Amino acid sequence: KLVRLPGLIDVHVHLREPGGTHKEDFASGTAAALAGGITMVCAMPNTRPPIIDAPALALAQKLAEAGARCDFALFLGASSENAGTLGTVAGSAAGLKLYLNETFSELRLDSVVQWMEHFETWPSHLPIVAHAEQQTVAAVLMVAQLTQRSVHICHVAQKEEILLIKAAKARGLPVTCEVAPHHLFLSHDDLERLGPGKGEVRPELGSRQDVEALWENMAVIDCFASDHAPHTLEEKCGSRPPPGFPGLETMLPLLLTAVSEGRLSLDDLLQRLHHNPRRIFHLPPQEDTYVEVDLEHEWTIPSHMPFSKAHWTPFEGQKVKGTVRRVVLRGEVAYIDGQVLVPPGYGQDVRKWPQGAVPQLP
Amino acid sequence: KLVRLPGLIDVHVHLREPGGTHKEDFASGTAAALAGGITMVCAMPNTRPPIIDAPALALAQKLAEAGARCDFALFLGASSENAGTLGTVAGSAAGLKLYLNETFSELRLDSVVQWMEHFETWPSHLPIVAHAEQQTVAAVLMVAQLTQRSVHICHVAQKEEILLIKAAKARGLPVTCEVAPHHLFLSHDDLERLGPGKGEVRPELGSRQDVEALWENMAVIDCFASDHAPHTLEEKCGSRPPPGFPGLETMLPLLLTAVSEGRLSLDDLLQRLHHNPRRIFHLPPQEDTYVEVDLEHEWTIPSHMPFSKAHWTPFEGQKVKGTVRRVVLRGEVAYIDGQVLVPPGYGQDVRKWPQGAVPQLP
Ligand SMILES: O=C(O)c1[nH]c(=O)[nH]c(=O)c1F
Ligand SMILES: O=C(O)c1[nH]c(=O)[nH]c(=O)c1F
Ligand SMILES: [Zn+2]
Ligand SMILES: [Zn+2]
Ligand SMILES: [Zn+2]
Ligand SMILES: [Zn+2]
């Protein structure tokens, strides 16, 4: 007996096109999404070139429309030069992403004053998300309060971060957050198996106590999102390993395992992979779209999942219970038992749908 | 310039059919809903006969399918006899409603033990909502904790209730709540104008300090819902006035006025009349459905709104800014500038749609 779920949404993926297509492209990354039960993705802007101006967004839109197999929205990225310049295209993006810790030169912000300028100029009704680790969470929250608006914190990893967000929510502040599966199912204890290259990720893996704190504070977590960050094994094991893990194909199986163990309920999962993503990012429903899962089948994660070009996974060897059997996307069978059946280009930009525009006052 | 909103959802209406059709019926109450920008309603079970067993639910389903002009789900009601008997029909209902304070004999629960029995027997994945005033909020929260599940508190009216819910959410407890417009826009100060009959409602109107506390604690309010409770003027002004106000036609205009004054944002409103209702009650999207509003037009609420058979309103004389201009429901024009254009029977039971069933483990 299969369980029918709505179309799940991952608000944090890196699809690497343009400019890093040996790591992933729209076609391979959205195949990975469908195989993971994900029918809509929001793609980060740290591509090459990065999505920091209107021409780069226009190129990325066409590449996604031609390559994506599931539906999508594309983030814009904040830079040291573009505050006050994005107003005409802002509403066509998923939101604005701020890289407040480590990043590439083009996305680096030199001052908290530059963060303020973005919060002041980006349209007030549109989403802002931040990569913000440890005390940076408190700092960006202060900027949000000074500018009287909301913020969403990406990939929360540590006890100190989730407790700070919990304290802010207790004071009624408009902050939401997401947690990635590696910060719920891996810890420092796994670094000896993974090694120092494969284990590189930002935010870094937490301690066992960090992991325990995220589970204890599930009520504070608004979304799950993969931070799918594919790099090849050669890159992860080489002389200057880039940070990040692939995760689209493993996220739902890991979380279904936790549901079957009673660590959270099916509803808790659907709030965090469907309803809260929809409402925080103003993402539209997908007609005639659903995912059928088998909650009984036990399997062991292999050394690589079938679709991501990363061709490796940090979850190798973990035993899971739960598997995606079939995905229907807008009335067409998109995935069945390991086979993707919609071509590159089947996916659409949800911000172009009438129901996908963010409502605003005139 | 009109603003496009998604189809709004009111999770708390009394439509009086069967058995009280001089006060309202499915046809008139759903006309009132559409005129208020509401495209889906959840109807309470305290009809005559009340919806407390399978035969009564079957009758109500047919009356709604024949009379409703917008989409709907129907609540079941808890009684002193029906715990453990609703399992076959539970999933076809909006949820289970508990009347924990004043009510009719058939819906009266004699003991907190009977509340426990309902929490233990009603399927764990389906919604439970409670009419629970003052210390009853704490009492039903304790029952929810003892039985390890969630609860939703109807029409929160007082400072003491919203602060208790706030404290429970700070402890990570699974509780949500709704607030009705009369508890945001009327207070004891209005009882001299209204008089003692018209002013009768349960929960009663709060003090000015209660109203201020609800606004200050907006972050704690998950939903707005009208508690549309129509009675005729003759009944409200007679010797034994029944409690309740009509509210479908005035709820959105009142809240749009508050948006235009900066008391809450448009997003804050849409979370509370669209996204959070959807996610708490597992209500499906409505395809090709939207509401167009004019935020500039100032008008004064008259002595009765056009559609509700209540034919009176406690908001008479209030100045509002905001009006519903057009409603489209599943691809058909349903309302334009005071005219309803879909017939009785156009509305459907959303729990019969494949996407409207509540997901559960096998
Ligand atoms: O794009 C990436 O690989 C990446 N990887 C990470 O581990 N963290 C990031 O913040 C990031 F942008
Ligand atoms: O049905 C009604 O009129 C009604 N009216 C109220 O004012 N409160 C209730 O709890 C109720 F059930
Ligand atoms: Zn990041
Ligand atoms: Zn990322
Ligand atoms: Zn009530
Ligand atoms: Zn009621």
Curated annotation (Swiss-Prot), chains A, B:
<feature type="binding site">
    <location>
        <position position="16"/>
    </location>
    <ligand>
        <name>(S)-dihydroorotate</name>
    </ligand>
</feature>
<feature type="binding site">
    <location>
        <position position="154"/>
    </location>
    <ligand>
        <name>Zn(2+) 2</name>
    </ligand>
</feature>
<feature type="binding site" description="via carbamate group">
    <location>
        <position position="97"/>
    </location>
    <ligand>
        <name>Zn(2+) 3</name>
    </ligand>
</feature>
<protein>
    <recommendedName>
        <fullName>Multifunctional protein CAD</fullName>
    </recommendedName>
</protein>
<feature type="binding site">
    <location>
        <position position="14"/>
    </location>
    <ligand>
        <name>Zn(2+) 1</name>
    </ligand>
</feature>
<feature type="binding site">
    <location>
        <position position="227"/>
    </location>
    <ligand>
        <name>Zn(2+) 1</name>
    </ligand>
</feature>
<comment type="similarity">
    <text>In the 2nd section; belongs to the CarB family.</text>
</comment>
<comment type="similarity">
    <text>In the N-terminal section; belongs to the CarA family.</text>
</comment>
<feature type="binding site">
    <location>
        <position position="202"/>
    </location>
    <ligand>
        <name>(S)-dihydroorotate</name>
    </ligand>
</feature>
<feature type="binding site">
    <location>
        <position position="231"/>
    </location>
    <ligand>
        <name>(S)-dihydroorotate</name>
    </ligand>
</feature>
<feature type="binding site">
    <location>
        <position position="12"/>
    </location>
    <ligand>
        <name>Zn(2+) 1</name>
    </ligand>
</feature>
<feature type="region of interest" description="DHOase (dihydroorotase)">
    <location>
        <begin position="1"/>
        <end position="329"/>
    </location>
</feature>
<comment type="function">
    <text>Multifunctional protein that encodes the first 3 enzymatic activities of the de novo pyrimidine pathway: carbamoylphosphate synthetase (CPSase; EC 6.3.5.5), aspartate transcarbamylase (ATCase; EC 2.1.3.2) and dihydroorotase (DHOase; EC 3.5.2.3). The CPSase-function is accomplished in 2 steps, by a glutamine-dependent amidotransferase activity (GATase) that binds and cleaves glutamine to produce ammonia, followed by an ammonium-dependent carbamoyl phosphate synthetase, which reacts with the ammonia, hydrogencarbonate and ATP to form carbamoyl phosphate.</text>
</comment>
<comment type="subunit">
    <text>Homohexamer. Interacts with CIPC.</text>
</comment>
<feature type="binding site" description="via carbamate group">
    <location>
        <position position="97"/>
    </location>
    <ligand>
        <name>Zn(2+) 1</name>
    </ligand>
</feature>
<feature type="binding site">
    <location>
        <position position="243"/>
    </location>
    <ligand>
        <name>(S)-dihydroorotate</name>
    </ligand>
</feature>
<feature type="binding site">
    <location>
        <position position="46"/>
    </location>
    <ligand>
        <name>(S)-dihydroorotate</name>
    </ligand>
</feature>
<feature type="binding site">
    <location>
        <position position="178"/>
    </location>
    <ligand>
        <name>Zn(2+) 2</name>
    </ligand>
</feature>
<feature type="binding site">
    <location>
        <position position="131"/>
    </location>
    <ligand>
        <name>Zn(2+) 3</name>
    </ligand>
</feature>
<feature type="binding site">
    <location>
        <position position="155"/>
    </location>
    <ligand>
        <name>Zn(2+) 3</name>
    </ligand>
</feature>
<feature type="binding site">
    <location>
        <position position="12"/>
    </location>
    <ligand>
        <name>Zn(2+) 2</name>
    </ligand>
</feature>
<feature type="modified residue" description="N6-carboxylysine">
    <location>
        <position position="97"/>
    </location>
</feature>
<feature type="active site" description="For DHOase activity">
    <location>
        <position position="227"/>
    </location>
</feature>
